[PDB]
Amino acid sequence: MKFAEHLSAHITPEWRKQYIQYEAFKDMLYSAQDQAPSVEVTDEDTVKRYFAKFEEKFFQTCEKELAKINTFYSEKLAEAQRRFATLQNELQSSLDAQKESTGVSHEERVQHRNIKDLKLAFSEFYLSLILLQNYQNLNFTGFRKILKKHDKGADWRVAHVEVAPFYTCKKINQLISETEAVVTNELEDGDRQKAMKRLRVPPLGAAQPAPAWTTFRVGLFCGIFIVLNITLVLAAVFKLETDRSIWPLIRIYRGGFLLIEFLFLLGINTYGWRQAGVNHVLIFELNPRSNLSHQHLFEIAGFLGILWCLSLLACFFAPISVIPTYVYPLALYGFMVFFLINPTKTFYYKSRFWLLKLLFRVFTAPFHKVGFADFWLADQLNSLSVILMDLEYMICFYSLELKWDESKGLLPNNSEESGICHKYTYGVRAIVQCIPAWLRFIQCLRRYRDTKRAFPHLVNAGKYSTTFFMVTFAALYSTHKERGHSDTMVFFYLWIVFYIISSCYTLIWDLKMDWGLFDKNAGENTFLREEIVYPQKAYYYCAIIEDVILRFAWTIQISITSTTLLPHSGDIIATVFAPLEVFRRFVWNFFRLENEHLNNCGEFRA
Amino acid sequence: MKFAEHLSAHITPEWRKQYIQYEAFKDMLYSAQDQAPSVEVTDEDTVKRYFAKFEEKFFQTCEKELAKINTFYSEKLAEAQRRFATLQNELQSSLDAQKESTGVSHEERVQHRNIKDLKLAFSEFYLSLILLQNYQNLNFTGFRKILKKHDKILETSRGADWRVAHVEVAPFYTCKKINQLISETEAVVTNELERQKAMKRLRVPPLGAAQPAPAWTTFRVGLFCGIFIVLNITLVLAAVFKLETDRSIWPLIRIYRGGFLLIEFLFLLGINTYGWRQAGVNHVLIFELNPRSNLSHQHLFEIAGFLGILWCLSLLACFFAPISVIPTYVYPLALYGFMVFFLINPTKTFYYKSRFWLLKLLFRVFTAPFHKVGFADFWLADQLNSLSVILMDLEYMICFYSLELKWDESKGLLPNNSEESGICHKYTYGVRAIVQCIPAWLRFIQCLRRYRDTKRAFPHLVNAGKYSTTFFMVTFAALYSTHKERGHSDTMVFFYLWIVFYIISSCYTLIWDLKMDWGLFDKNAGENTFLREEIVYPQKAYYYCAIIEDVILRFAWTIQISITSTTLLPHSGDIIATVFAPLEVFRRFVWNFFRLENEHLNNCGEFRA
């Protein structure tokens, strides 16, 4: 799209006559491409003459429009400071009239109407300032784009555009800060939240509502998913066979359910960030022009939910009666992976390719610098470890447990489980669960070796490394219970000895390094930090309590399982707790990204 | 909303200091509203003095706003004519540059770039002209609203004589020259710049009305559509598998066909209003709807999907028979009862304005002779002509729940046997006949009233014949059926008449559709073969396909009378009728698209005159 159509789409005609006429230069460039001769048509010396002309005429035209853009941004910055002076005098007059209502009622009612009217006045003035940054940054991007199209110029953009007064003058940016500092101290008399609520203008080309077609698709997918889920519940209640164990099916489909729930919660998270003002575009280093809003994620979440409901429903009662049952769980995940890769330039190709790059960089953790996106994804994998181990179990079941001859082999004939796949034997289960905590450990050590700062890159390393010992002790306990040694219970102690640590280690951390709460300076925000982006502190306290509970939720599992001795209690509690784990990650994302935006806690961009 | 907040929604802030600052006057009214003394507080003569001072002070304030807005529109209209002259100079200079490529390539490419750029120039010129029309009519309604609010508060009528004697003669309203300025813009663009494309770019959809519906309503439309689709599929599967194959499902089909027709009609009406809005046919003026707030296509898709969901659920509950203690014959009654309740809900929720407007329209239509027929009344009374099967199904359901259903049996909705012998589904007593002729009676009486009101024997009496043919059509059909029941010879002699009138009614109401409703086959055709001079919709293939579709569908019974008399299937007639009813609603949906266009263009109904 070459930053040509969407650029004109988000261009206001009011200043369009003096923006970088990118479309006009496109027309000139293609039209003069149409008259490119060959070696025989014009001699090589004349070819060099033609190319030298082309390049120098393009560069002098660029110089002319460069001078035009500098002239406009100089006059408009003089206008911006003149408007600063005028609006400052008007706000001083409003403050004097406030003193006429404070230090010395129809008059007071008129004065607060005037206060709100000037509030709207600096709102549209902030909009004009946003238009001026549009001028600046879109001019920069158009310069780069047209010049690199000509090149396909570099020392020209650097030696003209990067030093031109139309981008070297970052004061307009801090002028926006003035518009901030003028408001909060004078308009709101010290209220930051209402300021950022009113004056902060969402981008017209990015934060605009998504097309009604995408919202309709989201609604259609959500409705189909709801009805399919209801039909699935009824099918389980009635049409499901009660004489066969349904555990392999649950274990196979628990990963897909956890992934779809995660995508839906991530859509909610990105909506929350966008509304609260946390510019995750900069934090994630995403493309400012085109990015996935919350609806574009709800769409994929609903589509995959429909896909999972249909697959599970076909697994419940066979519709074809000639196709074996296991084909549905195989095909669902197979074409989910296909949709993930999808080499063709369709179905969110930009975001899918970006995610594929991120996954490749994360998985090969030690040999790559850790950005915020990489750390964030390798942390998200920590709470989605159930998906990885469930995929491992599905592979094991399809390899060494499933009977390919029997059509209804997915649901075992017997109601008892004795296969190797769901056991901790050989340590395979232990290893596939420690993968997410291995990537984070390696990434933390890489950050330490890249910044030579022992803190917090080494405390993070210990926090991530506790799970190694915890899982190892759990595996030893399971094996020694299988064999029945005297040391068995001893290993159990070590599990509980380390588990209560590996939760506390990830509980004093989530509340202090990630969420930044319990700050030394609190003031009005009890137990919180100085600045709270989100509206109500009740959300903050609910998040604290929820994380405190969910980091120890394993206590309930280890309490019921070791006491009640139900026919099948461990699997039930694990399957119940996995969605709670994903919910905990969803809650954590809000406050982690907010703190990263505010205090730059990760020291990523510095 | 008192035309205050939604008004503030559609107000460009750049002229906000120039319109009537309605909120300000709302504040001044509320001031002295809290400053109104009593008889004991101030004596009666002083009460009159205070009230008269209030009248005079709002009156000179209204005079000040009158003068300010008059001066602003005078300045803006002088600016508009200077802009018109200057843009005419620019556009004729573009004509000269065009002649450079025509009478006197990079130059031609640049010329068409300036052509598209100037097209944009008059795009925002049209936007500014529309803003001036806003300055006119929205401010007009602003004075209307503020003065009438003051009148109600102060129990006076001097505000009415003020608006009539100041605003109605004010230069800012009497000067309709800005509307003819838009007219000149359109004429110049059509003649010089470019009809279909000219009315496509210049015509700016209203910012407060045609703006896309909130995403929280498009989402609801999607949710309802998806639930409906899945429920529809589950219902088909339940019919294929879980439906009992020993009983006759005919009473259920007949009871539940009416709701399906109504929901399909509402969905097709949503499609129709989207088509009118996109094609540029303003249905707001023609239908006499409120320009500010009206139902867009999504607001109708929402109700259609919701009612489809409810119908599908009711049919499913009648199918699976859950709870196991509530009988099967409660679900259709509950569904139709709640539909009626939702139509007549008195609370100010769920499209209260639209529902009250529809209630008024239905009351005016059904008491046909006593009310002057507008376009809305004629249109609604015409819509029932293709929805008569719903009225027939409601009559059948009434008869079934009264005289044939067994209240003792739980599974009484589906009869024990597989044969039908009840009176309800027959033509006996003419109850199935008079119910069929109700929409025709309403239309016939409405058009006779139209004649008695305009004294123009045409086309108010030819249309009366069109709506009266079906009287003889139903009379002969019912009499033939009754005489065939007994077996008298004359029944055969009567049958001819039915078929005879079948080719005298469907023909008669065909030449009407293609000539006086749609207005095609006009004497002046030109390039538009078989069509009228000006066509709004893009492709003429749509028009020809519509002609073929209407020709086929107005003659539907030809197939039915061809099949039920040949195969002699035990239940061919009911199957064919149930198949044809949705086709009948589709034929009405197609007819609307072109009837409204012709009414907009040629004022064929002669309604607004």
Ligand SMILES: CCCCCCCCCCCCCCCCCC(=O)OC[C@H](COP(=O)(O)OCCN)OC(=O)CCCCCCCCCCCCCCCCC
């Ligand atoms: C046993 C049966 C159980 C069945 C459960 C199956 C799952 C049910 C799923 C429920 C619906 C999920 C999606 C609902 C929200 C859809 C959002 C959407 O697409 O609309 C956009 C919405 C409004 O648009 P606006 O904010 O004006 O524009 C923003 C510009 N980008 O803008 C927004 O995005 C903001 C508002 C929506 C986001 C906040 C609320 C999200 C949903 C909260 C949970 C709802 C219930 C979830 C499932 C039940 C479990 C609790």
Ligand SMILES: CCCCCCCCCCCCCCCCCC(=O)OC[C@H](COP(=O)(O)OCCN)OC(=O)CCCCCCCCCCCCCCCCC
């Ligand atoms: C495989 C291991 C199993 C464990 C789980 C691992 C995968 C979890 C799901 C993916 C991670 C969550 C989504 C990550 C993106 C979040 C970032 C965000 O808020 O913005 C969305 C992002 C923006 O991208 P954008 O700015 O449009 O790109 C412009 C490029 N110039 O755009 C995005 O949305 C980026 C992500 C791609 C698009 C949405 C996700 C598609 C996933 C398809 C299904 C995956 C199935 C995996 C197989 C499971 C089998 C068990």
Ligand SMILES: CCCCCCCCCCCCCCCCCC(=O)OC[C@H](COP(=O)(O)OCCN)OC(=O)CCCCCCCCCCCCCCCCC
């Ligand atoms: C991705 C994988 C590939 C796709 C897989 C196929 C699609 C999903 C699975 C559809 C399954 C449909 C049902 C198949 C029935 C097979 C036979 C059977 O066991 O019947 C179920 C039961 C039997 O009742 P019985 O009285 O024994 O019938 C006697 C027959 N004369 O009968 C009953 O209980 C009644 C039947 C109820 C069926 C409800 C099914 C609802 C969902 C269907 C699909 C909806 C999709 C909608 C969304 C699509 C996207 C727009």
Ligand SMILES: CCCCCCCCCCCCCCCCCC(=O)OC[C@H](COP(=O)(O)OCCN)OC(=O)CCCCCCCCCCCCCCCCC
């Ligand atoms: C045996 C199983 C059988 C299965 C059958 C089940 C029933 C099928 C039900 C299908 C329902 C589809 C209707 C839902 C469409 C709603 C679309 C919508 O609301 O989108 C908004 C759309 C674009 O909006 P925009 O122009 O951006 O802005 C408008 C300014 N306010 O604005 C619009 O509304 C305009 C564009 C959409 C409307 C025109 C096309 C809609 C209908 C297409 C056909 C649908 C299928 C019909 C059923 C099949 C039989 C033929």
Ligand SMILES: CCCCCCCCCCCCCCCCCC(=O)OC[C@H](COP(=O)(O)OCCN)OC(=O)CCCCCCCCCCCCCCCCC
């Ligand atoms: C009883 C006899 C049965 C035979 C059928 C008779 C009823 C058929 C359905 C109603 C007729 C179709 C609706 C006609 C609308 C035509 C105008 C149009 O396109 O605009 C929609 C109109 C605009 O209204 P608006 O401008 O918002 O309000 C004006 C004041 N501000 O707003 C509208 O949409 C107006 C209509 C009201 C809202 C939608 C319809 C709700 C009705 C609920 C279901 C009706 C159930 C009837 C009983 C059936 C039992 C068998």
Ligand SMILES: CCCCCCCCCCCCCCCCCC(=O)OC[C@H](COP(=O)(O)OCCN)OC(=O)CCCCCCCCCCCCCCCCC
């Ligand atoms: C407004 C009206 C009043 C309210 C209406 C109530 C809701 C609509 C009716 C729901 C009916 C649910 C099914 C009830 C079944 C009762 C038992 C029965 O006859 O079952 C039939 C079939 C075979 O059962 P069988 O195998 O014999 O059972 C053995 C017992 N262990 O067993 C089966 O049913 C097979 C499983 C398929 C069930 C498909 C049901 C799909 C629809 C459910 C509702 C969806 C609503 C979603 C939208 C809500 C809005 C968001």
Ligand SMILES: O=P(O)(O)O[C@H]1[C@H](OP(=O)(O)O)[C@@H](OP(=O)(O)O)[C@@H](OP(=O)(O)O)[C@H](OP(=O)(O)O)[C@H]1OP(=O)(O)O
């Ligand atoms: O839409 P995209 O896939 O992101 O590609 C477009 C555009 O592709 P097209 O040539 O097909 O229009 C190209 O614009 P130019 O720089 O060549 O003028 C270029 O991508 P390619 O050259 O590889 O095709 C560019 O860069 P990128 O793909 O890295 O984003 C990008 O345009 P935008 O950066 O403005 O989106």
Ligand SMILES: O=P(O)(O)O[C@H]1[C@H](OP(=O)(O)O)[C@@H](OP(=O)(O)O)[C@@H](OP(=O)(O)O)[C@H](OP(=O)(O)O)[C@H]1OP(=O)(O)O
């Ligand atoms: O929302 P609506 O039902 O259309 O009513 C509003 C508004 O009602 P509210 O007082 O509740 O805001 C009133 O505006 P005022 O004339 O009092 O300023 C008045 O209706 P009521 O007095 O009966 O409540 C008026 O008339 P109507 O309801 O007939 O339309 C109408 O305002 P609009 O005419 O601008 O729509």
Ligand SMILES: CC(C)CCC[C@@H](C)[C@H]1CC[C@H]2[C@@H]3CC=C4C[C@@H](O)CC[C@]4(C)[C@H]3CC[C@]12C
């Ligand atoms: C993550 C996604 C791709 C799900 C993984 C599915 C694929 C990769 C896995 C799951 C089950 C697997 C099969 C399980 C068992 C056997 C039998 C063995 O003798 C040859 C390999 C073969 C045939 C495997 C091939 C790969 C396989 C199809």
Ligand SMILES: CC(C)CCC[C@@H](C)[C@H]1CC[C@H]2[C@@H]3CC=C4C[C@@H](O)CC[C@]4(C)[C@H]3CC[C@]12C
């Ligand atoms: C560098 C340090 C801190 C981390 C190294 C992590 C690796 C080497 C650890 C983490 C989890 C461990 C496994 C946990 C459980 C089992 C099962 C047991 O019956 C044999 C050992 C075995 C298979 C362990 C092997 C080593 C292991 C894979």
Ligand SMILES: CC(C)CCC[C@@H](C)[C@H]1CC[C@H]2[C@@H]3CC=C4C[C@@H](O)CC[C@]4(C)[C@H]3CC[C@]12C
């Ligand atoms: C008390 C414990 C057990 C449960 C409560 C935790 C849950 C329900 C709370 C804690 C954090 C909360 C979120 C915090 C902030 C926001 C942003 C706001 O714009 C919308 C609500 C939203 C998205 C909240 C939704 C509810 C939420 C997820």
Ligand SMILES: CC(C)CCC[C@@H](C)[C@H]1CC[C@H]2[C@@H]3CC=C4C[C@@H](O)CC[C@]4(C)[C@H]3CC[C@]12C
């Ligand atoms: C209206 C929307 C929510 C869909 C309706 C779904 C719920 C309310 C329906 C669908 C399936 C129904 C159940 C189906 C079967 C039985 C068995 C018997 O004991 C009667 C009640 C009972 C237990 C029903 C109660 C209501 C029920 C649970």
Ligand SMILES: CC(C)CCC[C@@H](C)[C@H]1CC[C@H]2[C@@H]3CC=C4C[C@@H](O)CC[C@]4(C)[C@H]3CC[C@]12C
């Ligand atoms: C158009 C909408 C309202 C649907 C019509 C439903 C209502 C009006 C109809 C449907 C069936 C009807 C019932 C059918 C049969 C009888 C038995 C008779 O001895 C008294 C009246 C009574 C009890 C009727 C009352 C009205 C009734 C409940």
Ligand SMILES: CC(C)CCC[C@@H](C)[C@H]1CC[C@H]2[C@@H]3CC=C4C[C@@H](O)CC[C@]4(C)[C@H]3CC[C@]12C
């Ligand atoms: C004014 C004229 C032109 C139109 C009047 C239409 C009315 C009066 C007509 C139209 C349909 C007619 C009915 C059609 C069929 C039957 C059944 C028959 O067994 C007795 C007469 C009866 C019940 C008719 C009575 C009169 C009727 C109701």
Ligand SMILES: CC(C)CCC[C@@H](C)[C@H]1CC[C@H]2[C@@H]3CC=C4C[C@@H](O)CC[C@]4(C)[C@H]3CC[C@]12C
């Ligand atoms: C083939 C014959 C027998 C029957 C088919 C008729 C149907 C499919 C045709 C006839 C009239 C047509 C409509 C006429 C005009 C419009 C308005 C336009 O903006 C979108 C398409 C739309 C909405 C058409 C859709 C298709 C349509 C409904």
Ligand SMILES: CC(C)CCC[C@@H](C)[C@H]1CC[C@H]2[C@@H]3CC=C4C[C@@H](O)CC[C@]4(C)[C@H]3CC[C@]12C
């Ligand atoms: C005007 C143009 C389209 C001609 C229309 C012809 C139609 C209306 C005519 C011509 C032939 C006719 C059919 C000829 C023969 C019979 C057999 C008789 O036992 C019942 C009526 C029936 C089935 C007629 C029904 C009406 C009919 C189909």
